[PDB]
Amino acid sequence: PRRAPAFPLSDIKAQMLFANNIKAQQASKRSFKEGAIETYEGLLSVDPRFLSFKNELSRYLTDHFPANVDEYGRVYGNGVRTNFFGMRHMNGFPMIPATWPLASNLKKRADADLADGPVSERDNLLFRAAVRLMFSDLEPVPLKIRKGSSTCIPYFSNDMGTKIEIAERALEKAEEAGNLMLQGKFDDAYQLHQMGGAYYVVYRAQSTDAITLDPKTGKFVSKDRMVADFEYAVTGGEQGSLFAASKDASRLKEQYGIDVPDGFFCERRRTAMGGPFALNAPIMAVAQPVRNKIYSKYAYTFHHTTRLNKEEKVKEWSLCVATDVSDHDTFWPGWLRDLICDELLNMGYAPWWVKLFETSLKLPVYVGAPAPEQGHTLLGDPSNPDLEVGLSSGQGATDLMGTLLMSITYLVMQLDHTAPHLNSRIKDMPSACRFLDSYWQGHEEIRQISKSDDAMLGWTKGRALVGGHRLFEMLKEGKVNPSPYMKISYEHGGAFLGDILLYDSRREPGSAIFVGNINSMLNNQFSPEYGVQSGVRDRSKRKRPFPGLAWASMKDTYGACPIYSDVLEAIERCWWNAFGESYRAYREDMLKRDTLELSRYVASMARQAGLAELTPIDLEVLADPNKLQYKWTQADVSANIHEVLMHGVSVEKTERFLRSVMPR
């Protein structure tokens, strides 16, 4: 039922994706790469003392602090949701092979019994009302770009000046490019304006993944991660195979001379994609104003900052249901892209802009290196973008696409199973908009707090409450999917945006508190996704600019966890055993060094200004800016800190661009 076309790197269609420069040519050819990460300056992830430390600590913590999660997935007592074995990976060494991305998810969705469009007129009105509320009265803002981020296809530039030029030129030429695409002239739009081509597939480490200790054998077992081979990916699963990738790390001894202790595995690898920057810039210029609207007008549902900010909302609920979505990005439906585009056209959005947006969600994918001797293949034809990959991670509005799908999916679930008495309020577009506007502000008896695939669904006192309890019971039973749109279950150890919802004996939201996840502290400190990149001179361009700073925000982030002190003492004891040094003194030195280094980057900071004016969010973000891409937003960060990590295109250029896109 239609295999996607595939082109080797030697083909002209793949060659056209890479400009005539060293960086672009190296990106096209990059072979499978692996190696120990520099966890901290002068410390490799595979250092024998470090692995000895991880073995002792993971075993001790699991033993003394077993998971406290009830039958309904609610966390209580110690605030622990699983074992501590997730740290037992040889960081920088991936599972083999990584998956080939699916060119079409239509069969995947159909086989999972998920709908190929809105089920009812009510659902159609609600998805369309989400578009009308999110994209209406937007205000122009500067187009902010992450420092050191790549422009990907075709230039592969990491230079801010070049990126600003590309973005400004893209805002000037988006109209002409969109109009070419409306004529079916995709090759012309790409050749002239670099709008099109493909996503560039990079495989990112998920540094910690599930590991269990079999009591019968005393041997560790890593969670099997299913991967698709090339045949499966091009045929959307009609042909080829879906098999468990190998996480076995024994190979590292033979290949690299690295000692592999018992129960240490290769890391899980996830597909991540980088979009063609010239196509993303006009999308980002609309996406940022949309975020500003939803985080202000609909702050209740969408704007999440601190554990207390989340707590104030949840405490008012009679029932809180922490949901889980299976493989959100790959299941994300192309019919939603089409519905969104159709609704934007109805609202009066520039057709050329809608075409650019539509094209960004149908684009071919260039597969780099999933395994040794594999990859270097373009999936899909850039002359006529027609892929159904789901949601591409590097698309300019991915967070909004996932948020829109999921927010409506959860509301539909609440309507179907708990609140049929609210159906009469959704008769047409004006009434659907009024209802959704009220629901998103937290003014209804059914409520939610969400971000992409993470959410907590709420019920206050009223007619829907009884239904709310039946839905929770249906989720616990796990025999029937409560949604026609996505695969929904309950989260095993309910958490929202990193914070665990800690319940007491009553198991009620009113007396539950949000606490930091102690396991995430351990993941961040001992299993970072990236190395320190000590060879990258400009720290603001690194994946981890100032790692030492996270020590200063630790107490604020994790201090509320019941076992906080216990974990820090266990770390100290185990680090003494492994290195013959104080971990606390080691982190205090790193904190001092990074505080001093930070002042070189902040204009307002004198030669030794200190961290006094910085918030815990500022510190977590400076140590890990990836938190600014999934956890927080621009407004949550101090202005002088945001400038360290981002640079912008003037509001004058974006204001003119936005006026040309938006209705009258």
Ligand SMILES: [Mn+2]
């Ligand atoms: Mn959650």
